[PDB]
Symmetry: T
C-alpha cells in the first residue's frame, strides 16, 4: 500500500524466544513488531514490517518500498550485514536512507562480525540494546520526518 | 530419533557432466546408500538439497520443530560465505557434522576458510561419498548406543 | 545455438531510480537491442534477471539442459561474494564473459576482488550497456566464425 | 550521581566555529537536555568533559566512590587510542554505553577499530545528540524497577 | 578528433615465436584493424609502441599538444609497476580505456593490481584483438555521438 | 598390502591423567581396535608413535622399503610446524589420510594452518578415535574393493 | 596576524643529554630565533611546549579564540599516536605545517605512520631546527603576500 | 634518590573493588615492601603513580636531574599505546626494567605489542608483587657488586 | 624432583664461545647456583638440557610421573617454533615459568612470537642468569608458603 | 658543479595546461630562482629533468665524476617504484634531500611508501616550489657554514 | 652468441669509488674473465650493461634473433620491480640464471621479493664475481654435455 | 676437518624412488665428487646427513671443537622451520653457504621464507648437485687464497 517507515528483519530473527526461553528471554519478533506498530501509531505514522530468511526476498522488499513511498528503513540485517553486498546495493539503488540495528553487541563476539557491508552507508547504528534499539531508531525517524 | 542430511548448492549436478572424467556417482546414489544404512540400524533419516541459502535456513528451522537430533551437512560453497547458515545451526542448537566429497584444503586458498567448521562436532573431507556414511556411523552410535 | 545473458541483483532498477544518476537505458532496452543483434546473426538469445542467488544458480543448471554454448553474465553484487555462482558455472562447464556497466576498480576497495573473473574468458567493465553488445559480438564470432 | 555522562576531547568545540557549518547545538545544550531528562525520572545525573586522558581516568575512579550505577561515554578520538580508558572502566566495573554523534564507519578506516566497544553493553553512532538521550533512556529503564 | 592507441613493453613480440603459443596475431595486425575502423568513421588514429617507460610518457605529453581526445592503452607489464604512467595520463587529462589481450585475473596474483584501472573510463581484458576494437568502438561514439 | 598408522607427539598421553579428562581410552586401545579391524579384512597393519619428528621421518622412509600402500597419520602438533614431514610423505609418494581426535578448527587460530592437509587424500578431524577406524575402512576399500 | 609554534613531548630535553647528541641547540634558542624572524615581518609569534597531550589540545582550542592564522607544529611522539590532536586541528580549522628535527622515515617502522601528515599543508622532516624556520618563512608568505 | 619505581594508570585500584577477586594487595603494600628492601641495601628508592601520561613523562625528566641510576617501570596500559613514554626514557638515557603483575601474553592480542619492551634491560610479567622485588634485586646488583 | 628446570637447544654453549665478548658463566654454573638455592630451601631440583625437541618433550612426560610440581623452562629457539612443546606442557598439566637470558624483544621480529608465553604463569627475559633464580624463588613460595 | 637539482617524470608539465589549475609556475621559473639563490652564496648549481628513469641514473653517476657534494631530488612518481634510483644515490654516496611540491601523504595510499626517504637527509613535501628553496638553503648552509 | 651475460643498472660503478674500501673489481674485469672462460669451452659469449630498463628489454628481444641459448643475468635492483623484464625473458623463452654479487637476503625486507627468481633455472647470490663463473660453468655444461 | 658438508632431512632419498623422476644421482654420488674435489686442493672434507633436527645441532656444536672453518649446508625443509639450526650456526660462529638442489623460489609460497639465508655468506638454489661444487669451489678460495 504505502507506509512511511519500513522495518526489515534479516534471517534467523523469527527464532527470537523460541528455543529454551531461559536462554534469550521470552521476547519474540512479533512482540517487537507490536511494540513498534503501537509507537508509530501513537505518532500517527504509517509503519510496516517484513522478515525473511531469503536474501532476494529482502532485496525485493526493498525495491517494493520505493514504489510504496517509504521515507526511512529501520533494518536489522542479522547475519546479512557481514556478507551481503546486494543488500547494500539495493538500499543505495533505491536511495531510501536507513538505520542499522542489532539486538546483541556485535563487537563483543567473533572478529568476522566486526565487519559490515551496511554500516558506512547508514544514517547511524545501534547495537547491543535489545528491543529498545528498534524503538530508538523509530523515535529518531519520527523526529526526522514529522518534527 | 531423526537424522537430517542437508546437501548444499550444485550437488544435484553430481554425475551429469561426463561420467568418465568425473565419476558416475549421483546425488541419489548417495541418498539411497544412507537411507539403507539408516534402516539397517532402525534410525529415521531424512534428506534435503537446494541451491537457495534461504531454503536451507528454512529447512534447519523446520528440523527443530521435527525433533531432529543431528544434522549431517555438506554445505558445498556456502561453507565459505554463509554466516546465516551458521546462525541457523547455532540458533536451533542441533549438533552437526560438516562433510565434503573433495579435499577443500587442496584447492583455491579462499576454500580454506569456513563459517561452519569451528562449530561442528567434526569434519570429514576428501573421502568421497563414504564420508557421509562415516558421519552417519558416528551419528547412529552417538544417538543410540 | 543459444547464448544466455544473465543479470544479477538490482539491475532491474536500471533507469527507474533517478534518470539523472545513470545512463537512461533500462534493463528491457538492453535486452531488446541484444536480441535484435543476435537475430541479425541467426542465434537464439534468451535472457534472465533475478535478485536471488538460487534462482541464478538454477538457471545456469537449466542452461546445460538447454544446450547453451556461452553465458554473458553481469553478476552485479554477487561477483564479490558468490562462490555458489562460480561452482554452478564451473560445474556445467559453459564458458562465460563477465560484464559490468560501471568501473568496479574506481569504486570501494572490496569491489576489486571477484569469485568469477579468474575463470571467465574475459571481463568488460565501465563501458555501459555496450559492454553487453561487445560481449555478444565476441560470442557470435567464437561460435560461428 | 547515579548516571555519569562523560565527553572525550574536542566535544567542547560543538557549535563554536561557523554556527552555519555543523549546527548551533553546543555541549552545554546537550548537557542541559540530559539533566532535565533525568530530573523527569528523578534520577541524579552528572556530566564531565576533558581534553586530557588522565582527568577522564581519575573521573572514572571517582564514579566508583560516588556510587554511580552506569556511565554514558562518548570518548571521541580516544575510542581508537586509549587502552587506559578501557582498563579504567573494567577496573571499576561500572557498565557503560558508548555514544558517537557521527557515524564512525562512514569516516576513514582507522576509526573502525575501538578499544571500548567490545566491553560496552551497547553502542549508538550517527544519531547526533539524540544518541545520548537514547543511552539515558536505556539506563533509566535498567536502574529503576 | 584523434584517438591514440599506446602499446606497452613486449607487445612487439605478438605472434613472433612458435605461432602455436599465443596465436598468429601480430601488433601490426591489431593496428591495421584499428585504422580500418577509424578511417571508416573519418577519425584520425595514431599508434605507438615501446619497451621504454620514457618513450611512452613523452608520447602521452605529445598527445596533449596534438589535441588527442581519448587514449586506448594496453600498458602490459607497466600496469603493475608504473606510477609515472598513471601520473602522465592524469597530468594531461585525456580520458583513457585500458585494454589487455589476456585475462589478467587468471594469471599470477601480482598481476591483479593495476596503477591505471581506477582512473580509466573502463577496462577490457581477456578478449584478444577484439578488446582493442571494442574500445575504439566506444571511443568513436563518445567523440561523435 | 600393509597400512601404517602413525601417531605424532603427545598422543602417548591419551587417558593417562585423571580418567575424567579425555575418557578412559588409551593409545594402545586405539591400536588394538585398528589391528583387529584390519585382521577382519586380511590386511596386515603396522603402528608407530613418537614425540621425535626425526623418528617419524625415518619411519616413513622405512615404509617405502617395506611396500606400505597407504599411511593413516595423526601428526598432532607437527601438522602445523613440520615441512620435513610433508616432504617425507611427498618424497616416498605413499598416499595418506590425515586424522585428528579433536576439532582443530574449534581451537586457537594457529591450529587452522597445515603443512599436510593439502597433499592428503582427505581429512577427518573431531570424531574421536572412530576417525582412525573410518580412515582404515576407506583404506581397505581403495586397496581391496 | 598570529602564528603559533607548538612543540610536543620531550622537545624540552633538546641539548640536555650530552653536550653532543643533536647540538646544544636548545628549545629557547629555537624559540628566540623564530621570535626574531617573525618580528622582522611584524608577525606576532606564540610558542608552546608540553609533555601532556591534553594541554596541547587546550592550546590549539585557545588558538581559534586568539584568531591564529596558521600553526607550525612538532608533535614529537604524538604524531604516531594522537587522534585527539588531529581532531583538534581539524575542529578549529586552522591550517598547519608539520615539522620534525629528525627524519622519521630513517628510524623504526612505527614512526612511518602519522595521524597528522595527510591533513597538513605540507611536512618538513630531517633538517633539524631550520625546518621550523622554513615553515615560518612559508607561513609569512601565505599570510602576507 | 638512586632508584625510581613508576606505576602507570589504574594501578591505584589494586585491592579495592572485590577484596576476593584480585586479592587484598594494594599499591601502598608494594611500595612499603620495596622501600624496606631498598633500606636493607642502603639504596634510596623513590616511588610514583599517576593516571596521566604527562605526569609520568615529567617525572622521568625530573629523574634525570636527580641522578636516578635505574628505573623500574610498570606502565600498565601505556605500554601498548605510548611512544612519548618510550622517548622520555630514551631521551634521559636511564636504563629500565618493565614489570607487569599479570601475564600480558595470556590476554587479548593487542596486549602482546609494546613500545618499551625492546629498549628495557629485561621484562618481568605474570609474577605479581614479587616482580617488582626481583627487578629491584637485579637493580641493586647492577649498582653494588 | 619437586622442581624441574629444562634448558632447550644451544644453551649448552654458554661459556666457551669466546668468553670476552659474551662471557664466562656456563650452563653448569647456572645449574650449580640453582641446585644450591633449592637445597637451601630444602626443596629437590632436577635439571635437563638438550638440542633434540623430542627428548625435551619426553622429559616433560616423565615429569608427570615423577610428581614435579612446577617447571622452569628456557626453550631458547623452541619458544618460537614448537607447538608440540606447548601441547606437552598442557598434556601433563604442570604449571610453568618461561625464562630467557637475553631480551628477546630487543632482537629480530620473528622472536617476538611464542608458543608458550600465553600458558606460562609468567615470563622473565633479559636479566641473564638471575632470571632463573627469580623464577625458582617465586616457585618456592608457590609450593611452600 | 657543487649542487645538483634533479626533477623526475611529469614535472615538465608544471604550468602548461590550464595554468590556473595548479599555478603559472614552470619548472623553468623554479630553476631560475634556484640558480640565482645558489649564486648568492657562490655555489655552482646544475639542474636536470627527465621522464626516463635511465637518464636520471646516468646523471647521478655523472655527478660523482663531477664532484657534486649534495643532490636535491624531486623524484615524483619514481619515489614509489624505483630501487634502481635508491641504488644510484647510494652507489655514488652523495647525500640528498627529497622534495615534493604537493602533500604526497594527502593522496592515494600507495604514495605513503618511498624507496628514497629513509636514506635522504630529510624530506620536504606540500610547500610548493618553496620546498626546493628550503632544500637549497639547508644545503648551502651545510656545505659552507 | 651462444651465451649472453646481462648486467642491470648501477653495476657499471663497480670498482670506481675508493677502490681500497669498496673493492677493486670492475665490470670490465668480470666480462674479461667470462669471455676467456667461454673461449676455453669453444662457446661465444656476449655481454651487455645498461641503466635503462628498456635497453635491457630490447637486448633480450635481440637475443632471440641471435639464437642465444642461455642468458646469465644480474638484473640488480630491477629484480625487485621490473615485470617487463620477466615478460621479456618468458616472451622470447630463453632460459636464464639470476646472479647477484651480494646476499640480498641479508639486506632490507623488500630485497626478499623478486619478479624473476621463480622462473629462473636457479639463483646464485652473495658469492661475488664467481657467482657469474658458476652460472657460466653450469651453462656450458647444459648446452653441450 | 676445515670444511663440513651438512645435508638436512629427506636428502637420503636422492635417486632412490624411480630412477626416471629426478635422475639416478644419490647422496653418495654428491659426497664423492665433493671429497675428490677437496682432495685435489689438500683440504679434508667431512660430510653428514640426518633426518633429526638435534643430530644436526649436535653435529654443528662438534664442528666448533674440530676447528672447522666453513660449513656448506643444505638444510632442505629445515630452512623454513628451524630457528634452533640458525642459532647453532651463529652460536659457533662458523661461516656457512646455503645450498638447495631445486629452485626453492619456483615452488609453494611458504618455501620463500628461510631462517638461514639472511646469515649465510651466500645462497645457491636450482643448480642441482653442481651447487655443492660451486659452494666448495668458493670456500676453498676463501680458506686458501
Amino acid at each position: 500500500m504505502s507506509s512511511t517507515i519500513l522495518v526489515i528483519h534479516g534471517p534467523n530473527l523469527n527464532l527470537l524466544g523460541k528455543r529454551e526461553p531461559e536462554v534469550y528471554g521470552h521476547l519474540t519478533l512479533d512482540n517487537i513488531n507490536r511494540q513498534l506498530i503501537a509507537q508509530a501509531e501513537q505518532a500517527s505514522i504509517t509503519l510496516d514490517t517484513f522478515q525473511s530468511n531469503w536474501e532476494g526476498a529482502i532485496v525485493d522488499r526493498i525495491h517494493q518500498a520505493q514504489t510504496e513511498g517509504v521515507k526511512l528503513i529501520i533494518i536489522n540485517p542479522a547475519a546479512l550485514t557481514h556478507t551481503s553486498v546486494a543488500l547494500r546495493d539495493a538500499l543505495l539503488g533505491v536511495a531510501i536512507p536507513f538505520i542499522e540495528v542489532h539486538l546483541s553487541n556485535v563487537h563483543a563476539r567473533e572478529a568476522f562480525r566486526h565487519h559490515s557491508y551496511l554500516s558506512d552507508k547508514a544514517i547511524g547504528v545501534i547495537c547491543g540494546l535489545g528491543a529498545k534499539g528498534y524503538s530508538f531508531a523509530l523515535d529518531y525517524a519520527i523526529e526526522k520526518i514529522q518534527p
